[PDB]
Amino acid sequence: HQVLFQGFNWESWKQSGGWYNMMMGKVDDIAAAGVTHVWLPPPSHSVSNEGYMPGRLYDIDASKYGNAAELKSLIGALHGKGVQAIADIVINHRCADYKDSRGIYCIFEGGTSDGRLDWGPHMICRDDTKYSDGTANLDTGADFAAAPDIDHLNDRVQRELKEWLLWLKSDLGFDAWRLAFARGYSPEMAKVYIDGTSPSLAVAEVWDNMATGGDGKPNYDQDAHRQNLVNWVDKVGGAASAGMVFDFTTKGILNAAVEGELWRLIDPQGKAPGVMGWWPAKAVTFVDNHDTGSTQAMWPFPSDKVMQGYAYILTHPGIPCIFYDHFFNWGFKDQIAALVAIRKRNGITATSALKILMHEGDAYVAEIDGKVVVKIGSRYDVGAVIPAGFVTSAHGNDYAVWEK
Ligand SMILES: OC[C@H]1O[C@H](O[C@H]2[C@H](O)[C@@H](O)[C@@H](O[C@H]3[C@H](O)[C@@H](O)[C@H](O[C@H]4[C@H](O)[C@@H](O)[C@@H](O[C@H]5[C@H](O)[C@@H](O)[C@@H](O[C@H]6[C@H](O)[C@@H](O)[C@@H](O[C@H]7[C@H](O)[C@@H](O)[C@H](O)O[C@@H]7CO)O[C@@H]6CO)O[C@@H]5CO)O[C@@H]4CO)O[C@@H]3CO)O[C@@H]2CO)[C@H](O)[C@@H](O)[C@@H]1O
Numbered sequence: 001h002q003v004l005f006q007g008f009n010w011e012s013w014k015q016s017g018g019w020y021n022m023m024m025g026k027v028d029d030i031a032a033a034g035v036t037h038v039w040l041p042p043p044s045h046s047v048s049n050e051g052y053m054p055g056r057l058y059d060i061d062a063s064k065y066g067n068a069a070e071l072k073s074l075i076g077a078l079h080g081k082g083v084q085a086i087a088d089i090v091i092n093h094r095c096a097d098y099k100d101s102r103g104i105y106c107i108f109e110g111g112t113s114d115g116r117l118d119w120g121p122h123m124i125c126r127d128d129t130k131y132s133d134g135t136a137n138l139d140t141g142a143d144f145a146a147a148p149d150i151d152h153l154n155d156r157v158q159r160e161l162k163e164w165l166l167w168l169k170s171d172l173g174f175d176a177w178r179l180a181f182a183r184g185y186s187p188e189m190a191k192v193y194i195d196g197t198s199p200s201l202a203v204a205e206v207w208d209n210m211a212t213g214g215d216g217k218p219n220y221d222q223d224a225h226r227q228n229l230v231n232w233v234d235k236v237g238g239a240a241s242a243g244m245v246f247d248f249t250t251k252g253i254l255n256a257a258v259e260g261e262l263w264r265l266i267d268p269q270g271k272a273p274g275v276m277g278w279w280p281a282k283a284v285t286f287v288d289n290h291d292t293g294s295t296q297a298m299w300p301f302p303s304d305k306v307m308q309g310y311a312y313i314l315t316h317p318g319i320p321c322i323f324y325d326h327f328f329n330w331g332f333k334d335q336i337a338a339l340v341a342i343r344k345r346n347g348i349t350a351t352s353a354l355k356i357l358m359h360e361g362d363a364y365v366a367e368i369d370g371k372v373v374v375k376i377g378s379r380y381d382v383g384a385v386i387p388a389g390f391v392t393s394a395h396g397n398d399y400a401v402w403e404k
């Protein structure tokens with residue numbers, strides 16, 4: 001059994017009294033709903049309030065979300081209910097606290113009294129010219145324009161970041177990683193950090209553009225998009241690695257699918273069209289996150305159909321990740337918990353077998369492990385396609401589930 005939960009949104013840092021402190025009162029509800037792993041925000045000092053512009057990596061006390069003691073308490077509480085904690089790891093780039101003689105911010109401070117992570121421009125990818133001194137290796141991946149990109153090919157950088165990661169586990173209690181902007185460095189480099197730290201899982205955020213047609217809708221065939229994600233997993237070690245990826249292919253397709261185009265939910269081979277259909281054990285599915293939804297709203301799930309998104313990911317193969325707001329602020333808490341219970345009691349996992357029964361514009365009906373049937377769509381009657389022996393168990397707006 002495995003269900004992730006994003007425990008923060010874009011506005012979390014503003015929480016009165018601290019976000020971690022507030023989360024202490026949500027631990028029990030989250031654990032009772034069947035969640036096994038909670039993804040927490042970048043924990044270090046950051047030039048930006050949300051944490052995505054890390055500076056002094058060891059300075060947990062300077063975070064806007066809360067300090068080391070508060071974080072350690074929240075992780076301790078989570079563990080007490082058998083729930084793991086995933087840390088958001090932002091290592092593609094990093095901000096330097098001080099300026100050098102050139103007047104450029106490229107002299108770093110790790111947050112401790114000794115020299116750990118107290119880097120200089122020699123650790124900045126030489127091709128990031130706005131900040132480098134031209135002496136480092138070239139960037140192994142994409143560049144982040146708003147800050148110095150780190151040279152992961154540097155021996156000292158690799159050694160110190162691994163040491164830092166191991167510390168997040170031993171000192172704070174973290175169990176796994178969420179690799180932020182993973183396309184910023186090569187999978188070969190991600191492999192160094194993953195294999196060197198033994199996380200329970202390392203879910204990478206590889207967000208690439210989804211090919212569309214003349215009408216602006218994503219093309220039905222998204223094989224190139226999911227191939228890019230599967231290629232990343234193969235390069236980090238495949239089945240022998242703790243690495244996996246967020247299923248953005250399923251996210252982009254489902255966004256379009258629920259608008260009366262449910263025929264998009266099956267490929268020509270009869271499989272799910274996202275990463276879920278090719279390598280389910282390595283696919284972390286989701287309806288929205290702090291970027292796509294929340295207050296950034298870069299690619300929001302159709303608001304009136306959010307529960308169809310959950311009826312889909314919670315009953316299907318792949319590893320589902322519930323978004324904070326949807327669980328607590330949308331009036332869906334009971335419905336979401338009911339779906340997770342169905343997944344759990346029926347022994348459904350990331351590798352459960354999927355057999356799609358109907359995939360028409362206004363009706364998608366599928367059977368999982370021969371134990372659960374799920375339907376989403378505006379068409380009311382799908383009675384004729386429900387196998388003998390099944391009876392409704394959970395239902396709501398344009399969705400229903402049957403069990404044997
Ligand atoms: O006074 C307050 C302040 O004081 C002190 O801060 C000082 C710093 O310590 C010094 O280093 C120095 O700061 C410099 C920085 O080192 C340097 O990096 C900075 O860069 C600018 C940048 O040029 C600007 O463009 C801007 O950044 C924007 C950016 O352009 C936007 O695109 C955006 O980026 C956001 C995304 O919008 C958002 O989606 C999110 O993306 C993440 C996703 O959410 C996640 O899922 C995914 O995995 O990863 C992506 C990221 O890869 O987050 C992005 C980043 O936040 O917003 C940013 C703004 O946040 O501003 C940058 C900083 O200003 O230039 C300065 C030069 O001055 O000086 C500082 C002041 O003297 C103190 O240390 C600090 O704690 C305190 O807060």
Ligand SMILES: OC[C@H]1O[C@H](O[C@H]2[C@H](O)[C@@H](O)[C@@H](O[C@H]3[C@H](O)[C@@H](O)[C@@H](O[C@H]4[C@H](O)[C@@H](O)[C@H](O[C@H]5[C@H](O)[C@@H](O)[C@H](O)O[C@@H]5CO)O[C@@H]4CO)O[C@@H]3CO)O[C@@H]2CO)[C@H](O)[C@@H](O)[C@@H]1O
Pocket residue numbers: 223227230231234238239278279280
């Ligand atoms: O079934 C026994 C099988 O065992 C071994 O295979 C395992 C493999 O070692 C392990 O890595 C893992 O395989 C991954 C694979 O590495 C990864 O690339 C992906 O595979 C995707 C392809 O990426 C995707 O392109 C593919 O679509 C192909 C289609 O398969 C082809 O027939 C056609 O020509 O092209 C299309 C694309 O246009 O779909 C694949 C998924 O089915 O994910 C798999 C895991 O799902 O796991 C393997 C199975 O355990 C041996 O290596 C193999 O020889 C044995 O047959």
Ligand SMILES: OC[C@H]1O[C@H](O[C@H]2[C@H](O)[C@@H](O)[C@@H](O[C@H]3[C@H](O)[C@@H](O)[C@@H](O[C@H]4[C@H](O)[C@@H](O)[C@H](O[C@H]5[C@H](O)[C@@H](O)[C@H](O)O[C@@H]5CO)O[C@@H]4CO)O[C@@H]3CO)O[C@@H]2CO)[C@H](O)[C@@H](O)[C@@H]1O
Pocket residue numbers: 375377379380381382383392395396397398399400
């Ligand atoms: O098992 C025998 C049973 O069969 C028939 O009922 C079943 C039905 O045929 C089958 O398709 C399935 O129905 C699902 C439905 O597909 C699913 O979307 C959801 O339905 C929601 C609606 O989305 C929502 O709009 C709805 O509000 C309706 C309200 O239900 C109507 O009474 C009213 O007229 O209109 C409003 C607004 O349009 O509420 C539904 C409930 O969540 O869930 C249903 C299941 O409840 O399952 C049916 C039951 O197995 C026969 O009709 C029935 O008599 C037999 O007992």
Ligand SMILES: [Ca+2]
Pocket residue numbers: 109110111112113114115116118
């Ligand atoms: Ca130092």
Ligand SMILES: [Ca+2]
Pocket residue numbers: 093128143144145146147148149
């Ligand atoms: Ca950069």
Ligand SMILES: [Ca+2]
Pocket residue numbers: 092139140141142143144149150184185
């Ligand atoms: Ca980079």
